[PDB]
């Protein structure tokens, strides 16, 4: 086991944090807890919408959560009435005025977190794990991506002897910092144990 | 015949009690 997380490797160069705020030594952590707590709520509730990235912005006693969901209609609800039921339920733990934006997804087949979640879904749904890899990587490249790689690990097909299966198209320069590589992870639960789904999309260099 | 290692002679179980 060797390889560095490609997003933590690009923080400051190609990648921005999921939380933007200064806070001092005396209350940084307490903001971090809410931050982690917030995302829990929304990954727990807005998973069905195709959640991709929870950006959390803070100025002072007013917090600015920003969801990046594939189908935002599943978030807003009856014309702002689902968004409301959580724009409120957020303040129920927030304590601050929890201003909640929903942002469109440019192309879901270009959001590594989603590709993962969808392959993870398919293998949770008893499809051929080898097929799903070669299919996801196909869909990504059709979408103009300059390279894409998917990786499955665990008891594929419930085979006792765990295994690792992957497939890759285009190019994925992991050692390059100027390469924009969306990386997401999904976790696939089954009756026989757990499998890990890793998705790498080369979006292009800068 | 209880929790962890060493074993108490029953399969799987050890000597430590709660």
């Amino acid at each position: 086991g060797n390889k560095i997380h490609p997003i933590g490797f690009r923080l400051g160069i190609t990648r921005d944090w999921e939380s933007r705020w200064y806070a001092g030594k005396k209350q940084y952590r307490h903001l971090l807890l809410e931050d982690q707590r917030i995302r829990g709520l929304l990954e727990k509730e807005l998973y069905s919408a195709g959640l991709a990235r929870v950006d959390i912005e803070r100025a002072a006693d007013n917090v600015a959560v920003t969801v990046h969901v594939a189908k935002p209609g599943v978030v807003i609800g009856r014309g702002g009435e689902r968004i409301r039921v959580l724009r409120e339920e957020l303040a129920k733990l927030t304590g601050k005025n929890v201003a909640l934006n929903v942002q469109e997804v440019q192309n879901p087949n270009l959001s590594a977190p989603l590709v993962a979640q969808r392959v993870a879904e398919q293998i949770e749904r008893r499809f051929a794990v080898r097929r799903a890899i070669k299919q996801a990587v196909q869909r990504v490249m059709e979408s103009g991506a300059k390279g894409a790689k998917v990786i499955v690990s665990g008891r594929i097909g419930g085979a006792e002897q765990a295994r690792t299966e992957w497939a890759a198209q285009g190019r994925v320069p992991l050692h390059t910092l100027r390469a924009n590589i969306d990386y997401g992870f999904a976790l696939a639960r089954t009756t026989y144990g757990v499998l890990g789904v890793k998705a790498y999309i080369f979006l292009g260099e800068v | 015949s209880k929790k962890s290692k060493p074993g108490d002679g029953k399969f799987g179980r050890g000597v430590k009690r709660g």
């Binding site: 560095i4 997380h5 997003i7 933590g8 490797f9 923080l11 400051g12 990648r15 921005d16 944090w17 999921e18 939380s19 933007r20 705020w21 200064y22 806070a23 030594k25 940084y28 952590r29 307490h30 903001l31 971090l32 807890l33 931050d35 982690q36 995302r39 | -």
Partner: protein, 60 residues
């Protein structure tokens, strides 16, 4: 001995000296950083996601 010790560290104790940190993410008793309220592992996990304001893999 996990969950009942997650709770117990929260409880305010019979004595000041019995206070101790735990990771608020995973429950770890050891290697808990005060600044984050996090063990050294969860620290490295949340960091690499960029879910930690301003934190960046140092180098020099």
């Amino acid at each position: 001995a996990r969950k009942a010790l997650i709770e117990k560290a929260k409880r305010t104790p019979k004595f000041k000296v019995r206070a101790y940190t735990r990771c608020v993410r995973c429950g770890r008793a050891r290697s808990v950083y005060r600044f984050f309220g996090l063990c050294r592992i969860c620290l490295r996990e949340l960091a690499h996601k960029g879910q930690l304001p301003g934190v960046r893999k140092a180098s020099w």
